[PDB]
């Protein structure tokens, strides 16, 4: 694939920072989306 196809179809991590303060607003890990 051109471009490369990056698929977030496996459990990933993420976080939200605020730009200014560079503070870790929110941190997460999804393992199962349908786990509400």
């Amino acid at each position: 694939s051109i471009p490369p196809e990056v698929k977030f179809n496996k459990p990933f991590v993420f976080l939200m920072i605020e730009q200014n303060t560079k503070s870790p607003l929110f941190m997460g890990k999804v393992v199962n989306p349908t786990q509400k």
């Binding site: 471009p3 196809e5 990056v6 179809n9 939200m16 605020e18 509400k36």
Partner: protein, 340 residues
């Protein structure tokens, strides 16, 4: 020196990382969602009427090296951070607040009260702890006001003897710099587990993105920005490389990425999400070496002389929704204190 919060900022970060780490250790198989900032400020504005050993653990666990950093300065740092987050963004809403909810009998160490209003701009409320279903109410609302009705039932059971509670929220709503197209959003596979595949709506863009892959972190890393003063970073491990990633994470690394605005052409597939997480943090903060406030050794004599108090609950809840158009999340923390 100048805007001060970056004096505390990595201390926060490395906390988040580490608290996170515990939450991982607990169960490989759950969705994790918290908000570091929200958990932290509470234990910060709590520390401010704790004394001795018990104070020291809180701050400690938060990853502050008191030797290296004037405690007086820590609080300052925080005063700033809050301040700034709550600065009005034209495009993006981010709001947090802190409340103290007090049994109308309680005579407070006056200075504790000016401390929290000052430095943590906190709000105070005078309450009957003898109406548990009407107080519980009054609490739930503040938060459910606060997070615009994203969290409603933070307080599920409240103590009959409660002296006071420290409650603290965060609400965030931002829109992607370059949102996705909702047409293109097509229901594709997510492999949860090695045996479990679930179908998820996958939002798709092909375009010029901030992505790369660190041999370092054994992952791909994407940063997505918001219209505002904020950004999201998603870390897709390589295969088997998940705990690898989880460990190697550091604030440095985070700040490195953030300096890049170097784009790349790819095909990005990212699911549409709503998830929550609901935690009783005693235990996991137990791990992070904060234990004295939950026991019979606690010292909240900065709070009130009247009686020896202690913490009996610490409950975080956060919820997030990621869609094409952006994200909105929220988070809340609840601490309850009682006579021993």
């Amino acid at each position: 020196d100048h805007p001060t919060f970056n004096k505390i900022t990595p201390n926060l970060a490395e906390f988040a990382f580490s608290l996170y780490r515990q939450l991982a250790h607990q169960s490989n198989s759950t969705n994790i969602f918290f908000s570091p900032v929200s958990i932290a400020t509470a234990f910060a504005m709590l520390s401010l009427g704790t004394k001795a050993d018990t104070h020291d653990e809180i701050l400690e666990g938060l990853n502050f090296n008191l030797t290296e950093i004037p405690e007086a300065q820590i609080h300052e740092g925080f005063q700033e951070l809050l301040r700034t987050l709550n600065q009005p963004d034209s495009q993006l809403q981010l709001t947090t607040g802190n409340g103290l909810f007090l049994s109308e009998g309680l005579k407070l160490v006056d200075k504790f009260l000016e401390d929290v209003k000052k430095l943590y701009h906190s709000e105070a409320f005078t309450v009957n702890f003898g109406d548990t279903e009407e107080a519980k109410k009054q609490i739930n609302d503040y938060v459910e006001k606060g997070t615009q009705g994203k969290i409603v039932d933070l307080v599920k059971e409240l103590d009959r003897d409660t002296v006071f509670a420290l409650v603290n929220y965060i609400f965030f709503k931002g829109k992607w710099e370059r949102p996705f197209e909702v047409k293109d959003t097509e229901e594709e596979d997510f492999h949860v587990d090695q045996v479990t595949t679930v179908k998820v709506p996958m939002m798709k863009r092909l375009g010029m993105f901030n992505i790369q892959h660190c041999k370092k972190l054994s992952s791909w890393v994407l940063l997505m920005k918001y219209l505002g003063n904020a950004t999201a970073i998603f870390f897709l491990p390589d295969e088997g490389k998940l705990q690898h990633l989880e460990n190697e994470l550091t604030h440095d690394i985070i700040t490195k990425f953030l300096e890049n605005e170097d784009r790349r052409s790819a095909s990005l597939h990212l699911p549409k999400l709503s998830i929550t997480g609901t935690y009783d943090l005693k235990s996991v903060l137990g791990q992070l070496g904060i234990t004295k406030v939950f026991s019979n050794g606690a010292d909240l004599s900065g709070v009130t002389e009247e009686a020896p108090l202690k913490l009996s609950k610490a409950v975080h809840k956060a919820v997030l929704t990621i869609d094409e158009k952006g994200t909105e999340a929220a988070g809340a923390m609840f601490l309850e204190a009682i006579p021993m």
